[PDB]
Every structure is written in structure tokens, then in C-alpha cells.
Design a protein around this ligand. Structure first.
Ligand SMILES: Cc1cnc(Nc2cnn(C)c2)nc1-c1cnn([C@H](CC#N)C2CCCC2)c1
Ligand SMILES: Cc1cnc(Nc2cnn(C)c2)nc1-c1cnn([C@H](CC#N)C2CCCC2)c1
Lengths: 281, 280
């Protein structure tokens, strides 16, 4: 599909999860005028990592949706995934930099697009396992997409969960992810609640999930994951962001229910968010 | 390393396993004087088949041994594996055509070189899974090599077997390959016994493994099912006419139901070399 000799490195866009994304120009005519693209590649490659990356590529190839980064092709352990280039970058850095120009209505537009991306994911029985503002990308002021599927897994044909590791974003994890490594649509719903908290805290570092959970845990001879599991069991939850509307915080608190089956659906979350936004406007 | 524009098709050498090998000349100076080579390519290309072929290429790249066809390079999915050209072709067809000029001593020379190729494979924790006279190639009257690695697999770091499956040469398969799809050095040893039977039957069609097993099978059920029952009951290929006792004894030990009672390729190498030395 894409040749390596025509792939012109421009700058580093993201790194992590044994992977990196690079802004490249595909210039097969050598004029400096080709199309800018995103190139994901493996770091510390292993046959195991390469197998996961091949599955990642196939997962994104099956996805066509306005709120999911667009698969373009592949370039032939030097395997590279080629995607569209979203110019405004991660929502996390975009919100942190443009917060003064972003009101609650815009946050709901972002939240609505994430839900619709997750609902679509639902229809293919895919679990993201990494839903966070750092894995969401800004295309334009009116459009966000989910931009990485490095931990995404296909549910088995006979189960509603996948059991899975390495370093993990424990402050976004559902109780049953922490204790039994069980990942489900309902675990993505719990993480979407943390994404809503991130958006309404405007990525303020003092208020970040790791900051708030660490203050609640205290400053023992035990692991942070151990303390966090106890805090979640005792109904320890992230606080209401300053000025967060009650209907939005109510949505967060329902996403963070200990019972998997009492968590809302992404379809219900879509509808609720769209209507709250309609009310505000 | 190799460009397609300089790859000149000459003749078809082999086809099978969703793959084909072609005799090509690499003529970059366009004089018809370049080096003749073997080019393997995929047929019914599937990303999965492409992934298997990429691993096959890497497997052959890691192999350098007198009794293993030489990796030369790759040509870019139209991804093509380039190997040396062995001019006398597959041992199966060579033996079938030259049997009147080939005595038991020569069969032992062929058998010895296969064992040494398989032992080398052993050292890399590779299992061939397709050991047969059709995957052996003749370079000269004194040298043979294993020529295809289309089904070859790297053992996991923590296990002595690999569990795998399309159309398969069931009449070369070990009981535990048929029943549980388990492949091992010991499964390659079982197949080596069938290769020894092929060589000593001089590839006579009336005596082929599929011929003999089919006569023994005689239904209601699948051939694979009958074959599993025949092997469980100690149904085995017969002694080739004229096959020395030591050679047949080597076959019967290779075809032990118990994986761990099968000889090693190092033991088989030594035994074959000495029997050839005794025959002079
Ligand atoms: C896929 C993609 C497409 N366009 C852009 N555009 C961009 C980025 N920065 N700017 C200024 C402009 N970025 C990415 C991109 C970078 N990182 N990611 C992953 C996280 C997410 N989503 C990382 C890759 C390594 C692991 C997670 C996606
Ligand atoms: C790799 C190779 C190198 N040189 C030659 N020389 C040759 C062949 N015929 N003659 C007259 C001369 N042949 C091959 C060759 C052809 N087929 N194979 C595989 C089976 C085996 N071993 C096939 C490939 C597709 C499925 C298995 C190797």
C-alpha cells in the first residue's frame, strides 16, 4: 500500500505502550507536496508485540466512523500502520492549552463524539481498555476521534468480558479490572466517567484522577493498587469537578457503580449528554 | 537485494502449499549470463499465508548448512523468496528416474545427509512438519538438501512441541500429530522413518505410504479416523523388499507410539553412517 522510501519523517507525535506515532509525508513523486499522514510503529518489538500490533491494525481496518481515526494502510518487525493525520493533536493537550476558549457546551460536544465512537466499538464487540483524553484526537474545533487501539481486544464469541500484562492506567480502571483483570463494555463505561471528570476538571493537574486518588489513599506497607481497590470497595469516588452540572456528575457517579450491570450503556450516555447539551444551548 | 525487472522466468520447478518455485535468471546486466536461481512465491495469497511466508523466509535466512538449500535474498505482495538453484531437482523424482543406477549404499548417503540437515534444524528448535522425499533436492550425485520449509515452526521457549491446519500429508504424520495436532522433533523423526521407507521402496507407487495404509484400512468414517485406529493397533508400513534388518529396525523405532522412545537424529545419523560403512 505505502512504500518506506517515500515515507518522509517530519516530527514525533506520540510515544508509549511499546509504540510511537510519527507525522510523515507520503511523497511518492518527490516534490515535497505529498499528503501528511500518521505512522504508528513498534518500540522494543517482540513476536508477541508484533502479533498484538497485527491485531490492532486489523481492528482499525474494520472501523469506519466519523469519531475514529481513519485507517489508510500498512508499510512493509518493521511493519508500520498508516493513519490520517489529525492536525490539533490529543484532546488532553488541546483542552489544557485552549481551556479559556472551551465552555461546558463544547465539553458536551467532545463527550458526545467519544460516546458515539464507543457505541460503534460496542457494535463490533471491541473493548478499548484505554479510554482517556490522551487517546482522543482533535481534527477540527467541531470534531474529535478516538486515535489509538493499542490495548483494544475482541470479546470471545461466548463471553461478555475479556480477561488479560504490564504498566496500566489504574486510576481509569474498573474495580473488576484491578481485582480479576476482567475487561468489558461496562469497564469502558467506567473509564468514560473518568474521561468526563478529566474534561470538567479541564485537565487541571491538581485535580487529576491520580492526584485525587493519591490524596484519598494517604501519606500501610502495601501497594497503591491494593489501597485503590479498598478505596473503591468502600465507595471512595472522584469528587465533583468545580461547576460540573448535577446531571453530568450524576452520569459520572452511575458510570462508577461497583456493579457492572448497574452501569449505563453508551447509547443511554449518548442520549443523556446530547439532551443536557440541548438544554444548555 | 534482487529487483523484479532483472528476474527472468525460465521454467516451473514446483507448485504446492499455496506456493510455487520457479527457475529464474537474475540478469541485471541484460546479457543472459546472470546467475540461475530458485524463486518461491505465494499463490492463493492471504495476509495469514503472507505472514507464514515471511516467517518461512526468516527461518531459512537463519539456516546455513550443507544439507539445507541456501537463502540468497528477497524480491518485493509479490514478495518472492530467492534461493540457490539445485539442478537435479527433487530426490523423489530423481530416485524414480535413476533407481537402476542407485544401490543401498547411495540410499544411506542420501539418508545420512537428511539426518544431518534435520539435526541442524534441531539445534535451532525448528520442527519441519513436512519431512518427505518431495521436499529433498539433489545438487549433485553426492549431495542432497532439504528444499522447502513451508510448514516449519519455531518451538515456544517453554515447550518441546508446537500445536498448529489445512490439507496435510497424513501418511507421514505421527499418531499425536493426527489426534492432537502436536508437532515436535519426535514427530519429524516419525516422518523420517517414512522417508527411509520411500527411499527403500525406490518411490514405487504400488508400495507408497498412501497405497499401503489404504490397503490396510480396507467404512462409515474418515480416512484420518481409520488411520488413527490402525496406528493405535500397531498397524505399520511393511519392510521394503531387500531392506536390510538394521534399516527396517531404524524405521520401526521411528514409528514408536511413545514420543520419548523414538531415536534422536544424532543417534540416527551415527547408526546410518556405520551401516553404510559396514556395507562398504
Ligand atoms: C494517530 C494520530 C494521528 N494524528 C495525530 N496528530 C497529532 C498529534 N500531535 N499533534 C500535534 C498532531 N496524532 C496521532 C497520534 C499520536 N499519538 N497517538 C497515540 C495516542 C492517541 N490518540 C499514541 C501513539 C503511541 C501510543 C499512543 C495518536
Ligand atoms: C527450492 C528449489 C531449488 N532448486 C530447485 N531445482 C529444481 C527443481 N526441479 N528441477 C528439475 C530443478 N527446485 C527447488 C524447489 C522446487 N519445488 N520446491 C518445493 C519442494 C521441495 N524441496 C516446492 C515449492 C512449492 C511447494 C514445495 C523446491
Amino acid at each position: 500500500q505505502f512504500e518506506e522510501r517515500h515515507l518522509k519523517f517530519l516530527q514525533q507525535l506520540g510515544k508509549g505502550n511499546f509504540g510511537s506515532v510519527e507525522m510523515c509525508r507520503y511523497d511518492p513523486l518527490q516534490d515535497n507536496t505529498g499528503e501528511v499522514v500518521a505512522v504508528k510503529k513498534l518500540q522494543h518489538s517482540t513476536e508477541e508485540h508484533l502479533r498484538d500490533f497485527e491485531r490492532e491494525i486489523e481492528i482499525l481496518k474494520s472501523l469506519q466512523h466519523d469519531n475514529i481515526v481513519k485507517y489508510k494502510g500498512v508499510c512493509y518487525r518493521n511493519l508500520k500502520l498508516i493513519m490520517e493525520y489529525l492536525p490539533y493533536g490529543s484532546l488532553r493537550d488541546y483542552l489544557q492549552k485552549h481551556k479559556e476558549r472551551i465552555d461546558h457546551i463544547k465539553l458536551l460536544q467532545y463527550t458526545s463524539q467519544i460516546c458515539k465512537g464507543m457505541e460503534y466499538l460496542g457494535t463490533k464487540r471491541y473493548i478499548h481498555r484505554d479510554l482517556a483524553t490522551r487517546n482522543i484526537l482533535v481534527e477540527n474545533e467541531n470534531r474529535v476521534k478516538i486515535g489509538d487501539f493499542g490495548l483494544t481486544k475482541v470479546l470471545p464469541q461466548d463471553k461478555e468480558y475479556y480477561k488479560v500484562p504490564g504498566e496500566s492506567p489504574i486510576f481509569w480502571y474498573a474495580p473488576e479490572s484491578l481485582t480479576e483483570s476482567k475487561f468489558s463494555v461496562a469497564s469502558d463505561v467506567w473509564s468514560f466517567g473518568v474521561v468526563l471528570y478529566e474534561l470538567f476538571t479541564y485537565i487541571e493537574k491538581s485535580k487529576s484522577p491520580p492526584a485525587e486518588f493519591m490524596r484519598m489513599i494517604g501519606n500501610q506497607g502495601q501497594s497503591i493498587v491494593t489501597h485503590l481497590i479498598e478505596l473503591l470497595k468502600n465507595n471512595g469516588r472522584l469528587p465533583r469537578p468545580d461547576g460540573c452540572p448535577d446531571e453530568i456528575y450524576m452520569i459520572m457517579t452511575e458510570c462508577w457503580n461497583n456493579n457492572v450491570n448497574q452501569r449505563p450503556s453508551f447509547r443511554d450516555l449518548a442520549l443523556r449528554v446530547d439532551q443536557i447539551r440541548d438544554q444548555m444551548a
